[PDB]
Amino acid sequence: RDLSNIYQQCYKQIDETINQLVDSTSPSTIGIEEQVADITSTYKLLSTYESESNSFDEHPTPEPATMVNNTDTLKILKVLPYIWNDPTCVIPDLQNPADEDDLQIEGGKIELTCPITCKPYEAPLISRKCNHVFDRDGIQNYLQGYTTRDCPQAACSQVVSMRDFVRDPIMELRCKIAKMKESQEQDKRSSQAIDVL
Amino acid sequence: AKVIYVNEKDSEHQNARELLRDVKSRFEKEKSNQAEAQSNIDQGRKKVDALNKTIAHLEEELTKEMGGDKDQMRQELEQLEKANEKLREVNNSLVVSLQDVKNEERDIQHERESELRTISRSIQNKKVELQNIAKGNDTFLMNFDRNMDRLLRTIEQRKNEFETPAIGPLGSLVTIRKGFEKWTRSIQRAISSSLNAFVVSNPKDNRLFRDIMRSCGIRSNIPIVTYCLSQFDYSKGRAHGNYPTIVDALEFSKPEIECLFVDLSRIERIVLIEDKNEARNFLQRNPVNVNMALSLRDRRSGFQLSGGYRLDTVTYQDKIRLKVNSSSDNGTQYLKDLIEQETKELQNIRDRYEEKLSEVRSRLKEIDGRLKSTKNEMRKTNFRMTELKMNVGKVVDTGILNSKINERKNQEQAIASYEAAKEELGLKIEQIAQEAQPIKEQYDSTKLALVEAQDELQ
Amino acid sequence: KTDEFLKAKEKINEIFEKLNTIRDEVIKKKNQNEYYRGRTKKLQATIISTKEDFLRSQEILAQTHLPEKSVFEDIDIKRKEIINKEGEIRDLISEIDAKANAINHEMRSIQRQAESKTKSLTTTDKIGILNQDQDLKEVRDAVLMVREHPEMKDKILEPPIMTVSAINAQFAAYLAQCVDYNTSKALTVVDSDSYKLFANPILDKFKVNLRELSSADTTPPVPAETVRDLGFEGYLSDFITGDKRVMKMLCQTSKIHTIPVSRRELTPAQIKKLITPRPNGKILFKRIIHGNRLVDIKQSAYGSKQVFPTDVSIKQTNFYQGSIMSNEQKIRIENEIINLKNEYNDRKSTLDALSNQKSGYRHELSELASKNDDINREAHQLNEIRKKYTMRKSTIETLREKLDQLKREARKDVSQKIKDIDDQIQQLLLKQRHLLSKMASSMKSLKNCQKEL
């Protein structure tokens, strides 16, 4: 006798709330760290409750859980402040708990804009060793799917195996607020230049 | 078969949610657009109505000074010109009346100046004739003719010198008898020839006496009448009227001259009978062979009559025509008193003229006053038609005010355009609503259909 | 008691639904945000358009479009010129009033000159003889009465001294001594007995004479043409001119029927042919008219037919007017004065014409004043040009003062709602967080109730 998936549903409920917040901040917002901390509290508390409920799946005062947060989906929360700082940031963690070089990028300014066909990334996917990104664009069919050598960039630093390219939601989030804030200055200046002459 | 299967059916939830979002967003956005249209239209019409007639009222204070009376102010010229012409013509009539009355004044003037003094002097002349002794001017001896004085004063020498003796002109042989004054006031108009002339022998002497005029300056050729100095032929009727006749009432220096009277032309047969109709009494029968008579009209004048009823009115005046003991010097009392009594006519008829003249020229004062009133009406109408040069002369300075009317007008056209937009947008929203709300049933059913359990069955 | 805990779950579902409502509000508020950004786009468009509109409308003020004090000072100045018009109008009105007054002053003289033109020859009316005396004016009124009494006119006409006419006074003297002047001013009987039928008014209302026949032997009044004996020239009644009844009137009413006429100073020398009764029904040889004198002869019933003399001369004086001496006296008393007044009349009509020429000069001045007022109305076309350019200037000022409020309002009115959107975002941020905490707080009141199951 069990009732389980209600709480996967509540997981989805908090996830969809995170997706709500990620793009709802107004240009007038100052700091988000308290919001980040509160979402962290709720997320990790629900994670602990995940163990508190699974403790009886093996089947009160049961055995201690001892599981610790080491999953990939925790990444969805880490980055927001450094998006709030300025567009110069590059952040996807995978490995580093802190920023790219724990503060700085310094890795060659390949940016929102594509390295060659210089448009902003609009349908990207990342690989979790190389950080190569494509939108299945004009690099779509050179030798696609043949992961032994010659991923389309000269002298990379590893041989690769086939996982194509996978989820990364960080990409357009930094673009959104950056463009909003930068265009607000242009709007205000163009206004005040002519306002009441 | 049928192990896990339809767990994927939640996929319908995604399409349901996106359809819900699309329809709801369209509905809300277009409802907000309609609300925007409503608010904008309301605020615009409020904005205009806050000023619509304020400009008109502010304009219509000085503009009313030249206000909608324009039509009648312009047309005032017609009736003012009518007034001008009517005033001119009526004044023409007044001046015609005034100058015609003045023509009457001068006519009546000449009437009295040419008659009053002339006639008064004419009938006063008898007194100078009475009391003058001087050449040329009137004399006692004009009773026949003015210069007859000269002829008789010369005959004073020549009173024998022709084919028979001529001792007298017959005015000294025969004279009016004593005390016959009231019979005498018409002797001139009664007898005309016998007393004037002188005697000759026989009709051979027709050419005889005529032209010894050349002695002193006598005026006229003067008659010849002849009868001998003796009685003749009593063998026929000797007439004697009812009253002392020209036979009874005579005084004689030569008594034998009686006979020629009855032989005269019947101008001897004259009997004064007091009044006009008293002579009408019995001369019809012409008693004792008398034919002519005299009668009274007033103590001045009267009538000449014959036959009993025959009547005529003549010019009685106060001339005597004889050398008489009752001479002109005997009536001096009357000749003075009645003269002073009757010269009254000179002022009487004059007054009878100027009272009427005064009446008419006093009437003229009314038309003179009306002429002045019309001449003042002229300037009154001038100062009233000055309204033309006032209003038309004053340029309509409302333009600096009408500058603001164009926008106040076209704003209502703008509101009409926005109203045309809203009249269709308010129903675009409903048609979007009937697209949306029915679609919501799909989402309702999709959400409903998520139910299924997990059990130990095979 | 009944069921252990399964009547507790509903709370989590209700809180989940509330979170879903928060999400719906989130999406709605975001959409409102993109709606107000569209409002921002609209206001930006409006300002960018209106600013350029104002810039060019303001530059419209850079042209000359020169105004001056003349905007009202020219009309004020021409006030005195229109007043000059009014003064000329009243002066001309006075001049035409003088024209009318002179026209009337001349109409009377025109009537008189026409009357004189009619009077240029023999009498227009006989009644003019009696104007000299009061009693002659009584005779004038008697003439008017007989004209008012036609049955007394056609039987006793106007006096013979009135009706009769002749070439001159000397020719009118044919009828001057055979009948005395006093008798001469008696109305003219047609047939003997009209005397008794119509005497009264002439002798009582007015005071003049009448007379009756002496004999009525109506035959040739003189024994045949041998009567033209001493040079006698012809027939008295026909030598004078008048009505036949008038001619028969005096025949024996005043003893003129049997009288020859002659310019020669003749005389009734036939006296010796007549020492005899010799009536034969006639008394011819008593009286005649000869030259300018007259001898008189009697025939007495009592007498033995040897007659005795009598005589009177004929005066050439104011009697028997067919005219005022035909020409002689009139030439001076009327003709000369009326010809001088005809010269005066032409002069006065031409002086009224010169007054009308004075009027014509100011007629031309009146048309010139109207034409110069129309030239000032061309200046008024200029004035309307200036005032319509002031209409365009004031219209651009109205447009710019409208844009002044439009920009001032639009820049803030709806743009300030971003504060409301921000506050709603804050409310959403609070609600989502506290309701997630509420949802997480229900834990262990959950299915973990296996202490009592």
From Swiss-Prot, chain A:
GO-annotated cellular components: chromosome, telomeric region; cytoplasm; nuclear envelope; nucleus; Smc5-Smc6 complex
InterPro entries: MMS21_N, Nse2(Mms21), Znf_MIZ, Znf_RING/FYVE/PHD
PANTHER family, per database record: E3 SUMO-PROTEIN LIGASE NSE2 (PTHR21330:SF1)
Gene: MMS21
Organism: Saccharomyces cerevisiae (strain ATCC 204508 / S288c) (Baker's yeast)
Binding-site list for Zn(2+): 130, 132, 151, 156
Subunit record text: Component of the Smc5-Smc6 complex which consists of KRE29, NSE1, NSE2/MMS21, NSE3, NSE4, NSE5, SMC5 and SMC6.
Entry's Gene Ontology BP terms: chromatin looping; DNA double-strand break attachment to nuclear envelope; DNA repair; double-strand break repair via homologous recombination; protein sumoylation; regulation of telomere maintenance
Keywords of this entry: Cytoplasm, DNA damage, DNA recombination, DNA repair, Metal-binding, Nucleus, Transferase, Ubl conjugation pathway, Zinc, Zinc-finger
Protein name per the record: E3 SUMO-protein ligase MMS21
Role, per record: Acts as an E3 ligase mediating SUMO/Smt3 attachment to SMC5 and YKU70. Acts in a DNA repair pathway for removal of UV-induced DNA damage that is distinct from classical nucleotide excision repair and in repair of ionizing radiation damage. Functions in homologous recombination repair of DNA double strand breaks and in recovery of stalled replication forks.
CDD domains recorded: SPL-RING_NSE2
Top-level taxonomy: Eukaryota, Fungi, Dikarya, Ascomycota, Saccharomycotina
Zinc finger (SP-RING-type): 99-186
Positions of transmembrane segments: none
EC number: 2.3.2.-
Swiss-Prot record, chain B:
Intracellular or extracellular location(s): Nucleus; Chromosome
Main subcellular location: nucleus
One Gene Ontology term, aspect cellular component: mitochondrion
Single GO MF descriptor: damaged DNA binding
Keyword Nucleotide-binding carried by entry: yes
GO biological process: chromatin looping; chromosome separation; DNA double-strand break attachment to nuclear envelope; DNA repair; double-strand break repair via homologous recombination; regulation of telomere maintenance; resolution of DNA recombination intermediates
Record's keyword terms, sorted: ATP-binding, Chromosome, Coiled coil, DNA damage, DNA recombination, DNA repair, Nucleotide-binding, Nucleus
Record carries keyword ATP-binding: yes
Coiled-coil regions listed in the entry: 1-163
Domain statement: The flexible hinge domain, which separates the large intramolecular coiled coil regions, allows the heterotypic interaction with the corresponding domain of SMC5, forming a V-shaped heterodimer.
Family statement: Belongs to the SMC family. SMC6 subfamily.
Complex formation: Component of the Smc5-Smc6 complex which consists of KRE29, MMS21, NSE1, NSE3, NSE4, NSE5, SMC5 and SMC6.
Record's miscellaneous remark: Present with 339 molecules/cell in log phase SD medium.
Protein function: Acts in a DNA repair pathway for removal of UV-induced DNA damage that is distinct from classical nucleotide excision repair and in repair of ionizing radiation damage. Functions in homologous recombination repair of DNA double strand breaks and in recovery of stalled replication forks. Probably plays a role in structure.
Listed name of the protein: Structural maintenance of chromosomes protein 6
Name of the coding gene: SMC6
Shown segment, full-protein numbering: 367 to 824 of 1114
Curated annotation (Swiss-Prot), chain C:
Coiled-coil region list: 78-115, 325-431
Region described as Flexible hinge: 116-324
Annotated TM spans: none
Cellular localisation: Nucleus; Chromosome
Post-translational modification summary for this protein: Sumoylated by MMS21.
Free-text comment on this protein's domains from its UniProt entry: The flexible hinge domain, which separates the large intramolecular coiled coil regions, allows the heterotypic interaction with the corresponding domain of smc6, forming a V-shaped heterodimer.
Further facts: Present with 892 molecules/cell in log phase SD medium.
Reported function: Acts in a DNA repair pathway for removal of UV-induced DNA damage that is distinct from classical nucleotide excision repair and in repair of ionizing radiation damage. Functions in homologous recombination repair of DNA double strand breaks and in recovery of stalled replication forks.
Subunit relationships: Component of the Smc5-Smc6 complex which consists of KRE29, MMS21, NSE1, NSE3, NSE4, NSE5, SMC5 and SMC6.
Record family assignment: Belongs to the SMC family. SMC5 subfamily.
This protein's name: Structural maintenance of chromosomes protein 5
Organism: Saccharomyces cerevisiae (strain ATCC 204508 / S288c)
Species lineage: Eukaryota, Fungi, Dikarya, Ascomycota, Saccharomycotina
Gene this chain is encoded by: SMC5
